[PDB]
Design a protein around this ligand. Structure first.
Ligand SMILES: [Ca+2]
Ligand SMILES: [Ca+2]
Ligand SMILES: [Ca+2]
Ligand SMILES: [Ca+2]
Ligand SMILES: [Zn+2]
Ligand SMILES: [Zn+2]
Ligand SMILES: [Zn+2]
Ligand SMILES: [Zn+2]
Lengths: 226, 226
């Protein structure tokens, strides 16, 4: 468990000393106590649902480019999850994009056919890319950094119970985080940041907002709104 | 058969008039008679072993970049095919790279560990990317255009009987063609060009050489040797 967790999220030698060092890097990043041992608190954090994108970097197979070379992006919802009515998914995705439009000069237009910049889809287990999903729990979704083709796309594990509220896995929250990667953001070590790797089942969705860290990160790439 | 053949190699509408037009585009490109009907000669060409990369373009999922932004590239042989002894595969790949080094200012250094520019591997059926192999015959291999991560990589269908001579599928010939895509080349309509999509089971491997078309194509991207 801990081995592959460090392999997948902290690029630990794919082929003890090195492990304790990685355990510590993980503890520093996830806001735990920097000991180096598999504490009760540490083994617990590793069972919590999170984003599939690594913490110390980007997906090696599709690095992409640092940021979009244009401010007017297009998106398209390829398929839907049966857990929710089509209009609820559409709203969730639109509100997620709106969060980023607000703090940048970026715009998003929806396409219903063709090749859009950001393609959103639901999949389970093996879905064509090198990172298969893992059933309910653990990895919730993953997204790729800016670029052509598959880059910029966001995949959501359809083995999760996606909800409009917080009775399951909130689609809005996860989509907002994943769109962040689609625009060029990495994971943050700040526990109150949307870009934090672990899913925060927060009580009040109305009290939701990007933290200053999220804003600073996205504005350092595209600038502030005009 | 003909439907998916045009879908996969001539990006025919994924969702008759349009088909006859594509049948004709295919006939023009593959050196057949531009009729528009499923002739005996046409149905035959479609059963012949070929490269998995499309004829009217590039792989849409991983477009990559037009050419490498550096002349000194690295390559690595990830795994081997049991059909041949390790040294025979190594030679086949080295001779394939040599063909391109000769007519350009490009150099190739072999890495035995780490992330190289061009990763070569053998796979069967579903292998992690969006284009699964199809058992013996038909698609022999596929490669991606220049770029980071998976781009530049060459995959060989291990369901083929790879040989050192021409008693099966010559690894050297196919590797030389695939490396071509790895460097930025597209398929050519010239029947004597290495970049022609269909495998040419040629009699004398000593009489092998890049045609002027191959040379002109590769030199238009990287220039001639100094
Ligand atoms: Ca994309
Ligand atoms: Ca999961
Ligand atoms: Ca590569
Ligand atoms: Ca095959
Ligand atoms: Zn993430
Ligand atoms: Zn995926
Ligand atoms: Zn080819
Ligand atoms: Zn492949």
């Amino acid at each position: 468990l801990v081995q592959k967790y460090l392999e997948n999220y902290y690029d630990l030698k794919k082929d003890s000393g090195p492990v304790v060092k990685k355990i510590r890097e993980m503890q520093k990043f996830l806001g735990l106590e920097v000991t180096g041992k598999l504490d009760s608190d540490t083994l617990e954090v590793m069972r919590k649902p999170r984003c599939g994108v690594p913490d110390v970097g980007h997906f090696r197979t599709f690095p992409g480019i640092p940021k979009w070379r244009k401010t007017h992006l297009t998106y398209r919802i390829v398929n839907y999850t049966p857990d929710l009515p089509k209009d609820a998914v559409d709203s969730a995705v639109e509100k997620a994009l709106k969060v980023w439009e607000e703090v940048t000069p970026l715009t998003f237009s929806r396409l219903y056919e063709g090749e859009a910049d950001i393609m959103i889809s639901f999949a389970v287990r093996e879905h064509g890319d090198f990172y298969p999903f893992d059933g309910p729990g653990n990895v919730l979704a993953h997204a790729y950094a800016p670029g052509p083709g598959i880059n910029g796309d966001a995949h959501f594990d359809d083995d999760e119970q996606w909800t409009k509220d917080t009775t399951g896995t909130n689609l809005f929250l996860v989509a907002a985080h994943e769109i962040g990667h689609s625009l060029g953001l990495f994971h943050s070590a700040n526990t109150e940041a949307l870009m934090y790797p672990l899913y925060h089942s927060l009580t009040d969705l109305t009290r939701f907002r990007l933290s200053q860290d999220d804003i600073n990160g996205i504005q350092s790439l595209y600038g502030p709104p005009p």
